[PDB]
Amino acid sequence: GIFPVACSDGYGGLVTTDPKTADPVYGKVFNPPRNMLPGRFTNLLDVAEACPTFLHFDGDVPYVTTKTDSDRVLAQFDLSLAAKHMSNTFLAGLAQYYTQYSGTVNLHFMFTGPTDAKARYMIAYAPPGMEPPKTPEAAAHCIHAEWDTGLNSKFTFSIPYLSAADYAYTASDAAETTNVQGWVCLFQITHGKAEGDALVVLASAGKDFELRLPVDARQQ
Amino acid sequence: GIFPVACSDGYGGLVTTDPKTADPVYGKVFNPPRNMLPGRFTNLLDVAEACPTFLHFDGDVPYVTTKTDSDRVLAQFDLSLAAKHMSNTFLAGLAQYYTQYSGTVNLHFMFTGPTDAKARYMIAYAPPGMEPPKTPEAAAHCIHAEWDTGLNSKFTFSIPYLSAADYAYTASDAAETTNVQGWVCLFQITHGKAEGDALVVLASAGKDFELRLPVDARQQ
Amino acid sequence: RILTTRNGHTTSTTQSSVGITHGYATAEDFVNGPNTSGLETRVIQAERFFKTHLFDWVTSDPFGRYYLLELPTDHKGVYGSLTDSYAYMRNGWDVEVTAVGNQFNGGCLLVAMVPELCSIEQRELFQLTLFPHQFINPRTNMTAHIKVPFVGVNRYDQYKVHKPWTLVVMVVAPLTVNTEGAPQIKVYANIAPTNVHVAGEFPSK
Amino acid sequence: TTSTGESADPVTTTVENYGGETQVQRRHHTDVSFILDRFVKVTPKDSINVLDLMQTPSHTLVGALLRTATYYFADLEVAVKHKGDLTWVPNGAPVAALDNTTNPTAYHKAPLTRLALPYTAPHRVLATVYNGRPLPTSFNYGAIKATRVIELLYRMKRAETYCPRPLLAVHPSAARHKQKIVAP
Amino acid sequence: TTSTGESADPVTTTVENYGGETQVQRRHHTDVSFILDRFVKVTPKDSINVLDLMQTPSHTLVGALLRTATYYFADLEVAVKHKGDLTWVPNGAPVAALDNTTNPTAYHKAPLTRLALPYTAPHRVLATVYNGRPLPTSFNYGAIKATRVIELLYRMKRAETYCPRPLLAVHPSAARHKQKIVAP
Amino acid sequence: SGNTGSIINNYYMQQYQNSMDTQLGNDWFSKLASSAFSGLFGALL
Amino acid sequence: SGNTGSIINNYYMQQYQNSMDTQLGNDWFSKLASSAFSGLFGALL
């Protein structure tokens, strides 16, 4: 007698993400050599860390100009990988195909004024629960850090990851208007003959950014 | 030729309790850590032994008051995990999803009178075949045991398991009105200035309770 | 018999305690998780006792009056300021419920620290002895002193939204002022947060 | 066996107090990861419905030994009679996602379609009750959609629970809750 | 962490600057040969259509993590619902070739027909963009024909890419791009 | 170990079968049942 | 290694399964991420 098997029920359907592989039809193909082609990248987060990209501030420009009036806030935005200020950047373009994330997000601030213009800035991180700060004197109780312009232009501050739940979403449902993650505020303390200058910003992945649960959902 | 098998007949149906496991579709998921979360329980009888729960005597209260009249019986009830006196307790709530049981069932009696009130009680176990006893003098030929109130309040007596068949049912069919398991009677011998006091009772699983043949049958 | 407990610079003495009822664990789990990025600190100034009023035991009350409170409650002292000055924080609890009556008042009282709940039906009361509990019996003892660790879904909790624990009392047997007992009992509580951690800072006004 | 009752210390006296001798008591059928692995059936919705382990009824065998544990963690399994091209999004995907074929999609193959999908959620362990009755949005396993879902089943794998909760038996009007039992 | 910004040198300061302590960050779900292996669906043509990896839409998960790499090499897989006797020519065969049965021809067998065909092309590595928009004729994998092709899917195997390219997220009108999320 | 009753290792790998666990750095109610006092509390005769 | 999750070697040979590679004579962007300067650039106090 032949080896008897029992054809199980509810198995074998073509699941779009099955680990199986199909059976070949042609075989015996030797393709041209590709030894050491320049510029190969293996992981999609490796390129996110090594290459930062600009944000999208008011208007279309990626820079903020220095405020000479009584105001002190340059621009504050939500800490979400779907926020408007991060509309068109690699880190927020890649993180729409994944559901959850957990890690740090570096911010690179680069001052592009003349040689005879000086300024001083502050960036602070306000967690959820309280409305964001509106004055630098009321924001000095956060995880802020200040820098001064000079010979070295760029300063990079990496906002931390604080959350009750272990991982956080890369989306914002309409039911949640509270912005569960928080804010990140950027203030300008003072400036000297710095009228109409520019402070271009960038954004890069952190040293321990983690991105998971892939879902390709209606972008292209 | 390929390995020839014979697809057997009458096999492979989706039995609701098959030991097989389905085939995956997503894979590669690392969940958050759960090292040493407080209060994990592995078996459902472990919680039944370590935590007793109250009975349901006449009315809604779980206690019996002291009888000052000529009567001596406080309350006697069937020895069945479906009885009314055990309507709402963990041990009888868990034992409705299983068909049969075999073991001991402890009873914890706790006296809550004043400091100047004294009493003495008896609990006896009457097997099937004879109608239950009605007087303490006629019940002293059972497996009874008496205790006295004092410094230590609680006394725990574990009624034994006696049965011809090796296991016993956790139900009571209408065809069997004989109460095949028996009774458990609780009498009050005497009392001194113990008017209107209270003797709250409890019930816990035994040291060798065994519960088997699971059937989820029409409770929720 | 005699037992003196101390939390911080505050103490308490009871001469009739029947022990401490450790619940759900003896020690706490790991308190430096991967979510907080190590930006967490342990304040020690906020492990002192504080007091509140629950209700008054009386002869009219039959079996099944619970009168439960959910905590962390509002706090005048230090620990009340932390939830106002920090986002996430975690802490165990160390309760002590006292009901001073007399040697001659019959009755019973059950107190248990149960996890998250809003309301309990009358049928579930018969099975309240699954959570960390202790009986207050005026013939013998007058203090409960349960001791539970922090437990929750996620590691650090936002006490402005989720209140995990809830101290629950219950009259198992009615009070009886037979001959010489006190006419009524007034139940108090002596809770004290223990092992408080805190992470994430707020901007003031 | 008199001992102080107001102490919550377990006291399990045995049959050896009056001559008895305890037989051996083996408990395999009452484990917590063996009793939950049994395909409880839930009331299925129309085209789109979510995989939440709490829409199962509260009077079954899996639905009632689950609302006896405050916290629980368990992988999942389903077996649905989809009349179409059932798809499945992970936890947290925008509900418009379950229209694309890149998401894990099983094709029709009579009669059932049995899947074994992992546990994906931010929290380290879910919960039955929650002291905010509505639970949060984060407490689920995912959402499936088909043209017309006909049947649906749940089978928890590797289940492990914490912090028990009360179980309730049916209250009979008579002294004893009598009923029928199978008999030849 | 002030450093010369006009240097294109990566500078990734961490949380340990102000007391922090970086947890461990494991990235398996974001690899380049693990995320592309997922049967993206392409708009199928009539009787005859060519196997070009660029007719897949530019907004899917495979079609959009592919137009982010200038060059790529990957074996292929298909699964088509042919209503007939589907055949497949190699790369460069005269388009009248897909009428003969000697070429690899699969017979009808309900419901699908899953094939795993190699990568055949003169160039050592294909390209998404090309500075000659129309690409050359040489950039393809082959051409299949049947009486009426109904469905078609692409699943790259052993994918490996070079020279990254920009990825774009959807631009929201509001300050934040809100939308629905599955919830019980 | 639940309703798993085959003597052959499953065809698919472990990480694809179910979510791999992660560590940091019945358990308790079974410790409670063993702590149960059972001896006599008084002087037997 | 992609969505390949069987613990049994595929029935067909290697050369028939997929195109065999040829040699002559992530690689680079992962070398870039490790080159990333992260220390402090000034004198800490």
Author numbering:
A (entry chain 3), B (entry chain 3): 1 to 220
C (entry chain 2): 13 to 217
D (entry chain 1), E (entry chain 1): 1 to 132, 157 to 208
F (entry chain 4), G (entry chain 4): 15 to 39, 65 to 84
What does the paper say about this structure?
Foot-and-mouth disease (FMD) is a global disease of cloven-hoofed animals, highly infectious, and antigenically variable, which poses a major threat to the animal industry and causes enormous economic losses.
This study generated thermostable FMDV mutants (M3 and M10) by serial passages at high temperature, subsequent amplification, and purification. The capsids of the mutants M3 and M10 were able to resist higher temperatures than that of the wild-type virus. Among these three mutants, the Tr values of M3 and M10 mutants were increased to the largest extent of 6 to 7°C compared with that of the wild-type strain. Icosahedral reconstruction of particles was achieved at resolutions of 3.1 Å and 3.6 Å, respectively. Among the four residues mutated in M3 (V2056I, A1013T, K1133E, and T1174I), 3 amino acid residues were well observed, but VP1 residue 133 is located at the flexible G-H loop and could not be well resolved. Mutation T1174I is located near the capsid’s 5-fold axis and, thus, is unlikely to improve capsid stability from a structural point of view. However, mutation A1013T interacts with VP3 from an adjacent protomer within the same pentamer and forms an extra hydrogen bond with T3156, which directly increases mutant M3 stability by increasing the interaction area by about 67 Å2 (rectangle 1).
